[PDB]
Amino acid sequence: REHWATRLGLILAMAGNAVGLGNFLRFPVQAAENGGGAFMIPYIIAFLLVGIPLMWIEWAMGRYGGAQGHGTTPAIFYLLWRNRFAKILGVFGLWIPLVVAIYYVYIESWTLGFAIKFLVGLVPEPPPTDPDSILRPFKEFLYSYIGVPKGDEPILKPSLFAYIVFLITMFINVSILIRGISKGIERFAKIAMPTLFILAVFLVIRVFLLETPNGTAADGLNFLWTPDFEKLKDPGVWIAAVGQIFFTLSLGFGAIITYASYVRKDQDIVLSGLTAATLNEKAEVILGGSISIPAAVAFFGVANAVAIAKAGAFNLGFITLPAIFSQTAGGTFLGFLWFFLLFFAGLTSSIAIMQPMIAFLEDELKLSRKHAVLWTAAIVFFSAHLVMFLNKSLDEMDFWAGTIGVVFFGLTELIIFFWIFGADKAWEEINRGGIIKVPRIYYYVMRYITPAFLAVLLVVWAREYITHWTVWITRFYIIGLFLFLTFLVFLAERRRNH
Numbered sequence: 243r244e245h246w247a248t249r250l251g252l253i254l255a256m257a258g259n260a261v262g263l264g265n266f267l268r269f270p271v272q273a274a275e276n277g278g279g280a281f282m283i284p285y286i287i288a289f290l291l292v293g294i295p296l297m298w299i300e301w302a303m304g305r306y307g308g309a310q311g312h313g314t315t316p317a318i319f320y321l322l323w324r325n326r327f328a329k330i331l332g333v334f335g336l337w338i339p340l341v342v343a344i345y346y347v348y349i350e351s352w353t354l355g356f357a358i359k360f361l362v363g364l365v366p367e368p369p370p371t372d373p374d375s376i377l378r379p380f381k382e383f384l385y386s387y388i389g390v391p392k393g394d395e396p397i398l399k400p401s402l403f404a405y406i407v408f409l410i411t412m413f414i415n416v417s418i419l420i421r422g423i424s425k426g427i428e429r430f431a432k433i434a435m436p437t438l439f440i441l442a443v444f445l446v447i448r449v450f451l452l453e454t455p456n457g458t459a460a461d462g463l464n465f466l467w468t469p470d471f472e473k474l475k476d477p478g479v480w481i482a483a484v485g486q487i488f489f490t491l492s493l494g495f496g497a498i499i500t501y502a503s504y505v506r507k508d509q510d511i512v513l514s515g516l517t518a519a520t521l522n523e524k525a526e527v528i529l530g531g532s533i534s535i536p537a538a539v540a541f542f543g544v545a546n547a548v549a550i551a552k553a554g555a556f557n558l559g560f561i562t563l564p565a566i567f568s569q570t571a572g573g574t575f576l577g578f579l580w581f582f583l584l585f586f587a588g589l590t591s592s593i594a595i596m597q598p599m600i601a602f603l604e605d606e607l608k609l610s611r612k613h614a615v616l617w618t619a620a621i622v623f624f625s626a627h628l629v630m631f632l633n634k635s636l637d638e639m640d641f642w643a644g645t646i647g648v649v650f651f652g653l654t655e656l657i658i659f660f661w662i663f664g665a666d667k668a669w670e671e672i673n674r675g676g677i678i679k680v681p682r683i684y685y686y687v688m689r690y691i692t693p694a695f696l697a698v699l700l701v702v703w704a705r706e707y708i709t710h711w712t713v714w715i716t717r718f719y720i721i722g723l724f725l726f727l728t729f730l731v732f733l734a735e736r737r738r739n740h
């Protein structure tokens with residue numbers, strides 16, 4: 243089995259897995275919609291009671307599987323629980339990252355396309371201070387790129403440029419993945435993470451120097467880091483925070499598990515796991531939180547920035563921020579550095595959610611790396627045409643896989659590892675080879691607090707929160723993908739028989 247060459251390259255590959263579009267795009271929008279600092283308390287508690295323990299569980303399950311030659315959950319679940327239902331439940335750890343990949347790689351492709359155009363200066367020109375006259379050209383710029391419907395039909399029409407950039411983005415993902423774990427993912431991470439970090443720091447400094455009659459960047463930081471204890475009674479904030487924690491740390495995606503299955507059976511996962519998780523949180527609360535919101539607040543004030551963050555999820559990052567930047571000398575270039583940052587952040591993450599399917603084909607169906615990567619790219623590429631051409635298909639996939647799926651799957655992998663396999667075996671498996679030991683309090687968190695936390699959350703979700711007819715096209719398609727992956731698991735157990 244392939245293994246990570248260096249401890250550092252492992253940390254950075256895992257950090258790269260976690261540090262992505264979620265830190266710079268999803269987090270600020272989530273924090274601004276939910277009272278800024280009112281969001282941060284549940285977010286921290288979620289990190290301590292959900293984020294940390296599940297990260298340790300997923301590293302453990304991964305290393306455990308990999309030692310027996312299996313990198314994915316259909317098989318790993320079966321090792322921990324010798325039951326046919328374990329294999330079926332394990333299909334979600336191929337389904338979730340695959341469905342997520344289908345839309346995530348497309349959003350990643352936008353950032354590349356915007357980087358190219360912002361570098362070459364093919365950008366909208368606002369007139370030489372009326373906000374709507376400055377924002378609109380950048381709105382139209384995004385709308386033409388992705389092809390937002392102009393009438394009644396729920397159909398998108400991406401520009402020719404957007405389509406070819408998607409193709410290039412796929413080609414780039416493939417070229418990294420085809421070289422494997424040490425020479426591909428690890429090598430790229432060593433280049434990509436330092437670049438990503440430097441670009442983000444530069445932008446944070448640049449944003450910190452912004453001031454208008456409407457405000458400063460520091461008003462954005464005060465909005466984000468000032469608690470509201472009255473909001474702590476609102477369950478919506480808690481549901482939002484926990485969802486962000488999952489998405490941001492790549493928990494419940496089978497992506498951490500798979501990367502961990504290339505950690506040698508002896509090697510530490512406790513300190514490594516905690517460091518990768520902590521690097522992500524820095525890049526999210528310090529770097530990601532410091533760019534978009536403070537810049538929006540400076541130029542528009544708090545209440546306008548909140549309203550912008552509620553307008554959509556891509557309004558802030560693809561419209562508002564580059565619009566703001568265009569009002570400053572060297573702004574088109576500053577736009578380029580932002581989108582380049584986003585591209586590298588997306589790229590290190592999307593290779594993490596394509597690798598589970600690659601690992602399944604190699605481990606269970608015995609395809610070569612080349613064939614496994616090429617077929618995985620073909621399924622993502624083909625499937626992506628749904629997200630590219632059907633309005634709100636992205637939202638449907640992001641809901642079922644990226645939102646509901648991950649929490650369900652997190653609770654499931656915890657029940658399988660810590661309740662069925664055995665709480666004492668699991669704990670032994672986590673700490674085995676550890677540089678540091680996991681605090682004793684976390685045994686009771688993992689066994690009782692985390693699962694009760696998530697079960698209560700999911701109860702309120704499917705009873706107090708659960709559209710156009712076209713959402714059924716996407717549901718149909720992704721259900722079919724699940725059935726298809728079930729077929730492959732079936733074929734894998736048959737190959738093992740013969």
Ligand SMILES: CNCC[C@@H](Oc1ccc(C(F)(F)F)cc1)c1ccccc1
Nearest residue numbers: 263264267268349554555556636637640
């Ligand atoms: C609860 N979250 C809001 C839904 C939001 O989803 C996403 C938000 C951000 C990302 C990103 F991080 F960019 F990858 C991916 C998906 C979304 C999806 C499609 C359109 C608009 C918003």
Ligand SMILES: CC(C)C[C@H](N)C(=O)O
Nearest residue numbers: 260262263264490492591
């Ligand atoms: C799907 C995951 C790889 C997403 C990643 N953790 C992010 O925050 O962008």
Ligand code: NA
Nearest residue numbers: 260261262490
């Ligand atoms: Na993240």
Ligand code: NA
Nearest residue numbers: 258261590591
């Ligand atoms: Na990343």
